[PDB]
Design a protein around this ligand. Structure first.
Ligand SMILES: Nc1ncnc2c1ncn2[C@@H]1O[C@H](CSCC[C@H](N)C(=O)O)[C@@H](O)[C@H]1O
Ligand SMILES: Nc1ncnc2c1ncn2[C@@H]1O[C@H](CSCC[C@H](N)C(=O)O)[C@@H](O)[C@H]1O
Lengths: 265, 265
């Protein structure tokens, strides 16, 4: 009669909340999906061991096409949990699943967990200053769209930061690196010439947020584009106008060029 | 030699992550601050019991003025944890504390936890569509500023959602309700007349995110301004142009007026 959407966290199996773990252990059946985001520090094995229950993994089709056929039926009679990386409902399509639950007469509750949206706070950039977010899609075709570049421009003009998720191809095990996002954006800049993403643009890279020692680096594209930020996942941020304290943290904590402290008030 | 910034979550003591709990239990000393945000479902007692250690609570002055005198000294010799509501570093000033740690020769690590920034995903609004965020300050003086109203206008024009934190006075135990934020914003609208926040404006209220049964309601101000959303904390959101799926979720899950499904493409 109850379905619980439980977030697993960002890195490993301990990034789930105590509330999430306890509820999962009390559920008759436990499902999960691992295709929406990469959790670099754990496996299904470790997660299953932590919960002490076998977990039925669902594929993208299982979810998008047969969630109401696979999960909900059982949810009508028992307590069922559905696990996902990060925060359960931060994926554009996860929310709709709550609708299918309601319509099937199943009550649902959401158990939050660390998300990259809030975790970016560890970059020192003020969270309230972030504008619209976007994803740097993997280019497909000789000619491809670049709307994510327009989002950066739109935010930057308002002096707002831009969070950029980097595309992934789970089945192919392909995870776009910050380097690839930069290479790609520099090319878009030559084509659009908006002065939005140049060799001299200050950017911030956050790799493996959630782990104890993530890579946090800030600097000009020309300097970071060849830098190794470790294993994926990577996130790229294009800051808008910095507050002195933001810049202080980027210099002190992320190794940013000292000149960014001269924010030209 | 190590300082851990550990997030406690949004509602109760189980909103901390398993990683956070385990690390806290291994720390020689545990500090915390509870003034930045209200955790409506727990107490210091319950948190202390969960961790199994006495917790030295620090005041705003203890932190802002003497963090390097109270916490860091011990952090230099032992493993020390600093607990905070929600996500440790989502407070504009918390990040700077990592700087004081570095400068004192103390290594620090951040343990994330549920945050209201990501938790708003439970409203069905696409997280990437949120623009700049703002706080509805408690009015002080016969005449007072209302920059938060300008943030809404700026986002709305771009068709972006606006997340609005509501002010609190911890010592006074005063927590601004969504009703009070609405009353206040309607008054600002008469004065500024930007057509940004009217009787007919669609708004979303999220109360006690993190608890198992939070209040999620969407509707026109004229209809919600007199509605009771339960105990604090409350958060107010002014959606921009809705995607059909966003509207579908607001109607189905938050009881929004069916007419919002007619988004006037
Ligand atoms: N540990 C991590 N470190 C850096 N970036 C991460 C990350 N985890 C996720 N991301 C970014 O976010 C993308 C997934 S989008 C889904 C986010 C998830 N629903 C949440 O609540 O956070 C990843 O492809 C990557 O772009
Ligand atoms: N449980 C909750 N439900 C609704 N709003 C909440 C909430 N917890 C916090 N908020 C909102 O966020 C404000 C605190 S701002 C600090 C946010 C915290 N650092 C985090 O990581 O989330 C509260 O005053 C209220 O405006």
């Amino acid at each position: 009669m109850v379905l619980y959407f439980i977030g697993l966290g960002l890195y490993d199996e301990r990034d789930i909340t105590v509330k999430g773990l306890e509820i999962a252990k009390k559920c008759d059946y436990v499902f999960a999906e691992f295709y929406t985001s990469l959790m670099a520090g754990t496996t299904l094995g470790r997660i299953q061991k932590l919960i002490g229950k076998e977990i039925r993994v669902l594929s993208r089709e299982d979810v998008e096409l047969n969630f109401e056929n696979i999960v909900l039926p059982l949810a009508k009679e028992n307590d069922v949990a559905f696990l996902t990386p990060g925060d359960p409902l931060v994926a554009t399509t996860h929310a709709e699943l709550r609708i299918r639950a309601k319509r099937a007469g199943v009550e649902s509750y959401v158990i939050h967990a660390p998300s990259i949206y809030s975790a970016v706070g560890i970059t020192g950039l003020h969270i309230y200053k972030f504008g619209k977010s976007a994803t740097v899609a993997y280019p497909e075709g000789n000619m491809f769209p670049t709307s994510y570049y327009d989002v950066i421009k739109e935010n930057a003009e308002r002096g707002l930061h831009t969070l950029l998720f980097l595309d992934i191809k789970a089945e192919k095990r392909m995870y776009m690196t910050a380097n690839e996002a930069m290479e790609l954006l520099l090319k878009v800049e030559d084509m659009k010439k908006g002065g939005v993403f140049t060799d001299d643009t200050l950017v911030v890279v956050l790799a493996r947020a959630g782990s104890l020692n993530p890579t946090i680096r800030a600097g000009y594209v020309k300097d970071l584009i060849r830098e190794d930020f470790g294993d994926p996942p990577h996130i790229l941020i294009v800051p808008g106008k910095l507050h002195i304290v933001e810049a202080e943290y980027l210099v002190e904590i992320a190794g940013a060029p000292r000149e960014i402290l001269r924010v030209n008030v």
